[PDB]
């Protein structure tokens, strides 16, 4: 009942499909999420991975995929919604 | 803030090929979306989906035009292009680029480019003043304008006082004169009292000929 | 290829009253996601691209007022404007963003306002001196803000009716006062323009007790 | 399914649904203590005949496993 | 099993969130920052040990039967409060080749507790 | 895990045979008289808890990492010695209808021990 | 690799085959055995059940199915060997 | 101690049916075994498996005789019977009942019954003394015996001093006389010295006629 | 139907020496139980049923001495008597007790002993008085314990050779001294028996320097 | 399969076979203590890259996981 976007930059080495759609597998109770991971080289965006992610309170009830981490090496977000990893943005924690 | 801009020729010879390009600001083509699409709308007709592409190059097309349509993707310059071969007069339309999203619909749209398929060549317009009369009601309202004549193809955009005048502006549709050239007029309603103090300028832009004029109107 | 069909083609509704547009699809656009109803409604005004109004056939996009409500399921959907306002005069479209991709649009339904009777403001403009220098002459007549759209313009050069010659262009309904406006260009040769003296523009509309003539003589 | 009296279902208004059995058990531990009533699902009724969770010890444990609805009672000599 | 509270000090599942930072795993774990770990805390007296919901093995029950009638040597062996059900958890990390790998790891989240 | 001995008092599987007679199950169990039960006995210090062979959950390992660098509140929570593997056992008995039934019952024999 | 004799007196009520051969299912390590259970009504022998039995030290290395129990209500034996439950005898523990 | 005993007619008319029954002592038919079988051996020929049965009645037969063979099972009297229809002269054989075991082989056997298929009827023998001579070597050995003559069918068993004399006994095979009747002799070697003190008796048993004789032999 | 074939048919081996019998099956009688070799060997002596000697083609039954050893696998097996003893003279059989049931037996192999030369003990027995009363007469001659089996008995009634009349029956090898024994019955009518006086029995065997005659006259 | 030095295989002459890795780990517990060398099978090498049973703590735990045969050593400043 939950579907995400798939991406693997190491598509050739791992002999996996580069990009596409992924049907998730969870449980009757288990909430499912979509993850997205990328790089930011002072503006330029380099993709890393995208796909299914398991029940995590860090992703609970978050409609949008937003990286809350400030100035990290590998930017990451997760969200709870069908294809919500379609796009991502960065916005640090207010604090 | 995501912004999309189309770029390309407003005129295309028949039987040739049409090429346009969408540039993206606010976000990249990899982030900010998966599918990015192209839509077209002929004059006084409904919208038609052309195709869409992804940041990998996963291409999907409309069945009616799969023959000639070709979408490109350039991860470096935040662009995605459209190429349609063997053009006909039915391909005369306004072309838009949009963010084709799975959840939601066509989220963001570009302002579109009017592409005309013709054998004729470009012509720049001549701007004339539609002066407010000396006989206008002293305590009432008066009218003035700009007659933008003889141009091809379309379009032309008129503004007044560089966007700081909008209350009362009527930029009329164009008419095709017997010569095969267009004549458009834009007029503004204003009080007679303001004529002696305020100065009015109509900004005109015919992009297929890089014609840009700023005409002052006065009695 | 999920075919979309809209109804009706046009609407004329007094301001304040409700408006209703229907969209029927050739295949139920539901999905096992439970989000179902993969439909969108857009508002397009003349010079502008379409502005997304509603997605999921039910939920609104930010900034869109409460007066717009989406409804329906399966194959039949509806867009409803609880209270039509002047700024809502546009052409509305429906689209299916279902996964299987012949991404189809609806026909479009033009909504209009039913307003009170308004008489036009008539203005006449002789030809520019730079225009006369170029060898051609264009006399313009302007009928500003009137309702309904039915109006008649007549040209008289020294009291001689001008059949042919003139071209008319009318704007669309103003987003504020819901009125129309028309321009007529009478085109002449410079020599013919210089031969005659009185140039008149006679207008016939409902708001006028009798037809209105705005004229001028060539010398000032 | 089968409903029973549940001592740990404070929120659910003291009731549980199981496809198995209703259980009540009084424990007189060395240091007094008390008892409990709960639900035992079908899977936990092992062995098939005399299940482990339904056995009473001669002294110190009295258990009862019933299958009708809401069948948890006490059998002390009522004051 | 059951969930802990103030004055409820019998074998229960106690809420807890771990943060990798505290154990220096941020050096190789890109995500998550921490996860819903939960832990098992409490006592297993003879009146709850080896019973339904608060026990794992049918072995714990027979040992509890010995403990009940104070027989050697189980009378002195305390039954422990331990996890009975676990759940998998998602992780993104750097392997010892410093490549980026994502895997779903089993038996990381405590879901229920019981007696041994 | 490991097996117990004199002076070997760390978490181990200790040999034991039970006799149903001692817990009055002979009243309904025709056979066996008793079985190879075995039990888990010992301590789980920080140098063996959460490690390979002497641990169940990958959860016990993360908790042990907290315990190692004495962080709250796992520094005071002792990891218990508990069964990690079990085996089924055969039985012949009288059901509550007094019919004679034979069944193979799961999780009755302790095979290996570990830390929580 | 281990086979026994099967018997169920409640064959009709349990809708099972009355007597026959039974292929056991164990493990790579698991020793398998055959069991036999019957009644003795002062000489007359009434069968109860026969079949597979799991690893049990009580059955370890016993080639023959002998009931060691003295004067029981339900006589029982187990043995470690293919078809060793073919026959049974009674002989109490010497003590 | 398991013991098996066959019971049934030693004579059977041709084309009729033969019935024998095995009785079990030491154990029951339910305990003490699973399969119980029947074997047959014609005179001077090899063994042939007839069939076998279980305490449930699971019957298995030899392919050559599946046509006429029928095994029964009687859990009450510790018995299992054999019935073979439409008898021929080839069915003249010694019949044995045995414990047919899965592990091990034919564990225990009965002593067998000699079944003869004939139209002739039973006849009891006449026992005569083969007296030790007066001319036998005084310090040496002497011989004596019993001539058991005229009987049908077979067999006859001779013993000496009710089983307490075996050293030197030679019970010879029977011969079929021209009359269709059998003559057998059994003799014993003994010292001459013992003749005056010891008394010798030959016990004779022809079971198909209930003929049992104890004949004293002396000079 | 797993056919069994034994070899040889007979054996003559001096006491002390080894004996060897082979049994070949038309299908390998092995089983995935690893116990395999579902074969049995039996010993049958004249009056007795077969006595089980070895099962599993290798293992012995209680009481059976070490001098008997079973061997082989698959389709070919063997029974070996390391040191043949006098009490081992019997016919040995092999049988397959394989689960699939045409339960087949072997042919049988008769083992015999090769012994030293032994001369017979000759005895003659006139007819009983009760027998004479019944009208018939039977004169018996006994050749006790001799080896080898080749022997000739001749009857002489008043020095007249009796061709026809007599019937012979020989025992099998004695389980102790490994010898044979023979009986001859000469049958006569009572009248013919009373006519003649001297009844003689003349025996020819190797152990005899010359033939031996045991005789008697009717009067005592 | 892969053989390693085993401190608990006293009978097997201090050696174990695993389809996975050889492990050695020195623990300087608060109260001194010592170390251990053992075998970790392929199934227990989770996560795939940096397995949990192969992680060293900055202080108090030094672990090494190798894959060649008999590769368990010490690296103290030898006296
Ligand atoms: C990859 O690389 C980097 C991550 O390091 C990311 O780059 C950022 O991308 C932003 C778009 O998402 C981009 O836009 C920022 O500015 C606009 C417009 O801001 C106006 O003001 C700035 C400068 O003045 C700032 O004003 C604020 C007060 O409002 C003050 O607090 C700051 O200190 C001032 N900073 C400086 C310097 O003077 C002008 O330059 C600009 O032209 C505008 O007038 C905002 O719309 C963006 O979003 C939000 O920010 C404002 C505050 O600026 C908030 O008030 C609103 O809520 C608003 O929504 C945004 O701030 C940035 O330039 C850029 N930042 C950095 C650090 O690089 C990129 O997004 C990454 N991508 C991914 C996918 O990871
Ligand atoms: C179902 O029902 C019952 C269970 O309650 C079982 O019935 C038993 O079956 C036995 C066969 O397995 C059976 O046989 C016994 O006797 C024979 C022969 O014994 C000789 O002596 C007895 C009596 O004298 C006894 O002598 C011994 C000294 O040797 C002395 O200790 C006893 O006190 C004496 N008892 C009495 C009474 O005086 C004679 O009656 C008989 O005729 C014999 O001369 C044995 O071969 C049996 O086996 C073993 O027993 C002897 C001792 O008797 C041992 O020395 C040997 O090792 C020998 O192998 C057996 O003892 C019983 O009569 C009978 N017993 C009972 C209690 O009922 C039956 O087996 C059950 N079946 C199943 C399938 O469960
Ligand atoms: C990957 O490719 C295979 C073969 O084309 C296909 O079956 C599979 O569904 C694809 N999966 C994804 C996630 O793209
Ligand atoms: C029981 O009967 C069924 C059907 O005849 C058969 O398939 C099965 O193997 C039998 N099992 C036993 C143990 O006899």
How far is it, in rounded angstroms, from Cα B170 to Cα C177?
13
SS3 E63: helix
Q: Which residues of chain D are within 8 Å of residue F105 when distances are taken between CB atoms? A: 46-47
SS3 I193: helix
CA B7: distance to chain centroid? 11
Q: F99 CA to chain J: closest CA distance, Å?
A: 45
Residues 6+ apart with CB under 8 A from D17: D1, D2, D3, D39
How far is it, in rounded angstroms, from Cα A52 to Cα C183?
61
Burial class (CB in 10 A: 0-12, 13-18, 19+), E69: middle
Task: Give yes or no for a contact between C205 and C119, defined as CB atoms under 8 angstroms apart.
Answer: yes
Tell me the DSSP string of G10-48. Answer: TTTTTT--SEEEEE----SS---EEEEEEEEETTEEEEE
Q: Ligand 1 pocket, B31 CB below 6 A? A: yes
What is the SS3 string spanning chain B? CCEEEEECCCEECCCCEEEEEEEEECCCCCCCCCCEEEEEECCCCCCEEEEEECCCCCCEECCCCCCCEEECCECCCCEEEEEEECCCHHHCEEEEEEEECCCCCEEEECCCEEEEECCCCCECCEEEEECCCCCCCCCCEEEEEEEEEEEECCCCEEEEHHHCECCCEEECCCEECCCCCEEEEEEEEEECHHHCCCCEEEEEEEHHHCEEEEEEECC
Residues 6+ apart with CB under 8 A from B188: B143, B144, B145, B160, B165, B168, B169, B170, B200
Number of Cβ atoms within 10 Å of the Cβ of I180: 22
What is chain G's percent helix, strand, coil content, to nearest 5?
5, 40, 55
Task: Give yes or no for a contact between H124 and H152, defined as CB atoms under 8 angstroms apart.
Answer: no
What the block records as the tokens of D36 is 């409990």
Q: Is J14 on the interface with F (CB under 8 A)?
A: no
The dihedral region occupied by J30, where left means phi > 0, alpha psi between -120 and 50, and beta the remainder, is alpha
Q: F86 — phi, psi (to 5°)?
A: -130, 165
- Sheet containing strand I109-114, strands side by side: I10-14, I109-114, I91-96, I39-44, I51-55, I59-60
- Element spanning C191, H or E: helix C190-195
What the block records as the tokens of B46 is 């409904």
Of the candidates E17, E30, E36, the beta carbon closest to that of A76 is on E30
For ligand 1, the distance from its centroid to the CA atom of residue E43, given in whole angstroms, is 55
Mutate to test the interface with B, among A12, A62, A82, A86 (most CBs of B within 10 A): A86
For chain D, the first-to-last Cα distance in angstroms comes to: 36
DSSP I192: H
Record: contact G48-F89, CB cut-off 8 A: no
Residues 6+ apart with CB under 8 A from D27: D33, D34, D35, D36, D60, D61, E47
**Index of the ligand 1 atom closest to the CA of residue A40:** 1
Which residues are registered as beta bridge partners of B12? Answer: B117
Q: How far is CA H25 from CA A65, H5, H77, in A?
A: 87, 8, 10
Query: What determination technique applies here?
Result: X-ray
Tokens 């030197």 belong to H168
SS3 C88: helix
Q: How far is CA A70 from CA A73, A84, A92, A94, E90, in A?
A: 9, 21, 5, 10, 22
* Domains of chain I, earliest start first: 4-114 (2.60.40.10), 121-217 (2.60.40.10)
User: To 10 degrees, the CA torsion angle through E59, E63, E66, E72?
Assistant: 130
Q: H89 — phi, psi (to 5°)?
A: -65, -20
How far is it, in rounded angstroms, from Cα C152 to Cα C163?
13
How far is it, in rounded angstroms, from Cα F64 to Cα I64?
66
Task: Give yes or no for a contact between E109 and E87, defined as CB atoms under 8 angstroms apart.
Answer: yes
CA A11: distance to chain centroid? 17
H19 half-sphere exposure, CB direction, 13 A CA radius = 5
How far is it, in rounded angstroms, from Cα C26 to Cα C41?
17
Task: Give yes or no for a contact between E110 and E37, defined as CB atoms under 8 angstroms apart.
Answer: yes
For ligand 1, the distance from its centroid to the CA atom of residue A91, given in whole angstroms, is 10
Please give all residues whose beta carbon lies within 6 A of any atom in ligand 4, as ranges: G 6, 17, 20, 22
Please list the alpha-helical segments (H only) found in chain J: none
Record: contact A1-C33, CB cut-off 8 A: yes
Q: Provide the greatest CA pair distance for chain F.
A: 59
Where in chain J are the domains? Answer: 1-79
For chain H, the first-to-last Cα distance in angstroms comes to: 44
How far is it, in rounded angstroms, from Cα E62 to Cα F38?
11
Record: contact A88-B31, CB cut-off 8 A: yes
Residues 6+ apart with CB under 8 A from B11: B115, B116, B118, B121, B122, B153, B208
What the block records as the tokens of H80 is 């299992």
Number of Cβ atoms within 10 Å of the Cβ of H72: 14
Of the candidates G20, G38, G86, the beta carbon closest to that of H103 is on G86
Q: C46 — phi, psi (to 5°)?
A: -25, -75
Residues 6+ apart with CB under 8 A from D24: D5, D35, D36, D37, D63, D64, D66, D72, D73, D74
What the block records as the tokens of C98 is 């279902």
How far is it, in rounded angstroms, from Cα F49 to Cα E80?
15
Number of Cβ atoms within 10 Å of the Cβ of E45: 19
Q: How far is CA C110 from CA B174, C45, E77, in A?
A: 21, 10, 83
Record: contact B185-C169, CB cut-off 8 A: yes
SS3 C216: strand
Q: Ligand 1 pocket, A40 CB below 6 A? A: yes
Would you call the peptide bond into G27 cis, given omega within 30 degrees of 0 as the criterion?
Answer: no
Task: Give yes or no for a contact between I30 and I22, defined as CB atoms under 8 angstroms apart.
Answer: no
DSSP G70: S
Q: How far is CA A67 from CA A30, A85, J44, in A?
A: 23, 12, 33
Q: Are strands C109-114 and C10-14 parallel, antiparallel or unpaired?
A: parallel
For chain F, list the strands marked E by DSSP. Answer: 12-14, 29-31, 39-41, 81-94, 100-115
What the block records as the tokens of J35 is 């170390």
Chains H and F physically touch (3 or more Cβ atom pairs below 8 Å): no
User: Which protein residue's CA is at the shortest distance from atom 16 of ligand 1?
Assistant: B1
Burial class (CB in 10 A: 0-12, 13-18, 19+), E11: buried
Task: Give yes or no for a contact between H108 and G87, defined as CB atoms under 8 angstroms apart.
Answer: no
What is the SS3 string spanning chain D? CEEECCCCCCCCCCCEEECCEEEEEECCECCECCEEEEEECHHHCCCCCCCHHHCCECCCEEEEEECCCCCCCCCCCCC
What the block records as the tokens of E32 is 């998550």
Q: Which residues of chain I are within 8 Å of residue G1 when distances are taken between CB atoms? A: 32-34
Burial class (CB in 10 A: 0-12, 13-18, 19+), A41: exposed
Record: contact E93-J47, CB cut-off 8 A: yes
What the block records as the tokens of I56 is 């599993």
Tell me the DSSP string of A10-72. Answer: TTTTTT--SEEEEE----SS---EEEEEEEEETTEEEEEEEEEE---TTTTT--S-EE--SS-
How far is it, in rounded angstroms, from Cα I63 to Cα I85?
16
**Å resolution of this model?**
3.3
Compute the C-alpha angle J16/J22/J24, nearest 5°: 110
Q: Are strands G66-67 and B60-61 parallel, antiparallel or unpaired?
A: unpaired
Q: Which ligand is nearest to the CA of A4?
A: 3
Task: Give yes or no for a contact between B158 and B184, defined as CB atoms under 8 angstroms apart.
Answer: yes
What the block records as the tokens of D3 is 């409903």
Would you call the peptide bond into G5 cis, given omega within 30 degrees of 0 as the criterion?
Answer: no
How far is it, in rounded angstroms, from Cα I7 to Cα I18?
15
Would you call the peptide bond into B155 cis, given omega within 30 degrees of 0 as the criterion?
Answer: yes
* Domains of chain H, earliest start first: 3-117 (2.60.40.10), 126-217 (2.60.40.10)
Task: Give yes or no for a contact between H101 and I97, defined as CB atoms under 8 angstroms apart.
Answer: yes
User: To 10 degrees, the CA torsion angle through D34, D39, D44, D46?
Assistant: 70
Tokens 């508002």 belong to C43
Q: Which residues of chain G are within 8 Å of residue F99 when distances are taken between CB atoms? A: 10
Which residues are registered as beta bridge partners of E24? Answer: none
Number of Cβ atoms within 10 Å of the Cβ of J51: 20
SS3 H28: coil
Where in chain G are the domains? Answer: 1-95
How far is it, in rounded angstroms, from Cα B41 to Cα B112?
10
Chains E and J physically touch (3 or more Cβ atom pairs below 8 Å): yes
Number of Cβ atoms within 10 Å of the Cβ of J67: 10
How far is it, in rounded angstroms, from Cα C77 to Cα C70?
8
Q: H43 — phi, psi (to 5°)?
A: -60, 120
What the block records as the tokens of I55 is 């099962």
Residues 6+ apart with CB under 8 A from J16: J3, J4, J6, J9, J38, J39
* Segment H163-170 long-range contacts (CB within 8 Å, at least 24 positions apart): H165/H200, H170/I144, H170/I171, H170/I181, H170/I183
Tell me the DSSP string of I94-139. Answer: EEE--SSS---B---EEEEEE---BPPEEEEEPPPHHHHHTTEEEE
Interface subset of C 41-80, CB within 8 angstroms of B: 42, 48-52, 55, 61
How far is it, in rounded angstroms, from Cα J74 to Cα J79?
13
């Amino acid at each position: 009942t939950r579907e995400c976007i798939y991406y693997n930059a190491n598509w050739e080495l791992e002999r996996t499909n580069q990009s596409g759609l992924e049907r998730c597998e969870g449980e009757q109770d288990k909430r499912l999420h979509c993850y997205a991971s990328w790089r930011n080289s002072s503006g330029t965006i380099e993709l890393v991975k995208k796909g299914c992610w398991l029940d995590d309170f860090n992703c609970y009830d978050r409609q949008e995929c937003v990286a809350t981490e400030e100035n990290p090496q590998v930017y990451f977000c997760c969200c709870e919604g069908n294809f919500c990893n379609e796009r991502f943005t960065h916005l640090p924690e207010a604090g | 803030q995501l912004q999309l801009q189309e770029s390309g020729p407003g005129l295309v010879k028949p039987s040739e090929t049409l090429s346009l390009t969408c540039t993206v600001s606010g976000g990249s083509i990899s982030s900010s979306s998966y599918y990015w699409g192209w839509i077209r709308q002929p004059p006084g007709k409904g919208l038609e989906w052309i195709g869409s592409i992804s940041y990998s190059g996963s291409t999907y097309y409309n069945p009616s035009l799969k023959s000639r349509v070709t979408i490109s993707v350039d991860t470096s310059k935040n662009q995605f292009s459209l190429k349609l071969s063997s053009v006909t007069a039915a391909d005369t339309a306004v072309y838009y680029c949009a963010r084709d999203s799975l959840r939601y619909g066509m989220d963001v749209w570009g302002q579109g480019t009017t592409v005309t398929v013709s054998s004729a060549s470009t012509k720049g317009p001549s701007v004339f003043p539609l002066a407010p009369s000396s006989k206008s009601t002293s305590g009432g309202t008066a009218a003035l304008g700009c007659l933008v004549k003889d141009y091809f193809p379309e379009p032309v955009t008129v503004s007044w006082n560089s966007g700081a005048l909008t209350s009362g502006v009527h930029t009329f549709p164009a008419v095709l004169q017997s010569s095969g050239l267009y004549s458009l007029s834009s007029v503004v309603t204003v009080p007679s009292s303001s004529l002696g103090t305020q100065t009015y300028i109509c900004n005109v832009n015919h992009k297929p000929s890089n014609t840009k004029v700023d005409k002052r109107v006065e009695p | 290829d999920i075919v979309m069909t809209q109804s009706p083609d046009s609407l004329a509704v007094s301001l304040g009253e409700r408006a209703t547009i229907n969209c029927k699809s050739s295949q139920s656009v539901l999905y096992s996601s439970n989000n179902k109803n993969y439909l969108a409604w857009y508002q397009q005004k003349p010079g502008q691209p379409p502005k997304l109004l509603i997605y999921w056939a039910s939920t609104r996009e930010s900034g869109v007022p409460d007066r717009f409500s989406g409804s329906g399921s399966g194959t039949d959907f509806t867009l409803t404007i609880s209270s039509l306002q002047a700024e809502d005069v546009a052409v509305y479209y429906c689209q299916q963003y279902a996964l299987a991709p012949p991404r189809t649009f609806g026909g479009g339904t033009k909504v209009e306002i039913k307003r009170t009777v308004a008489a036009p403001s008539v203005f006449i403009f002789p030809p520019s001196d730079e225009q006369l220098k170029s060898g051609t002459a264009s006399v313009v007549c302007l009928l500003n803000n009137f309702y309904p759209r039915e109006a008649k313009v007549q040209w008289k050069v020294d009291n001689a009716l001008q059949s042919g010659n003139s071209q008319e262009s009318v704007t669309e309904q103003d987003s504020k006062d819901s009125t129309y406006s028309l321009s007529s260009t009478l085109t002449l040769s410079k020599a013919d323009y210089e031969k005659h003296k009185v140039y008149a523009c006679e207008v016939t509309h409902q708001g006028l007790s009798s037809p209105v003539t705005k004229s001028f003589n060539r010398g000032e | 399914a089968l409903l029973c009296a549940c001592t740990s279902c404070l929120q659910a208004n003291y009731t549980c649904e199981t496809d198995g059995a209703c259980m009540v058990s009084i424990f007189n531990l060395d240091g007094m203590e008390h008892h409990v009533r709960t639900c035992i699902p079908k899977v936990e009724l092992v062995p098939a005949g005399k299940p482990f969770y339904c056995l009473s010890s001669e002294d110190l444990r009295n258990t009862h496993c019933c299958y009708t609805d809401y069948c948890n009672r006490i059998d002390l000599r009522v004051p | 099993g059951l969930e802990c509270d103030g004055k409820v000090n019998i074998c229960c599942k106690k809420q807890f969130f771990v943060s990798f930072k505290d154990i220096g795993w941020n050096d190789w774990i890109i995500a998550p920052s921490g996860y819903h770990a939960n832990y098992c805390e409490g006592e297993c007296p003879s009146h709850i040990a080896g019973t339904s919901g608060s026990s794992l093995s049918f072995h714990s029950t027979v040992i509890n039967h010995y403990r009940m009638r104070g027989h050697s040597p189980f009378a002195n062996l305390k039954s422990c409060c331990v996890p009975t059900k676990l759940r998998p958890m998602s992780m993104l990390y750097y392997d010892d080749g410093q490549n980026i790998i994502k895997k779903d790891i089993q038996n990381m989240i405590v879901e229920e507790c019981g007696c041994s």
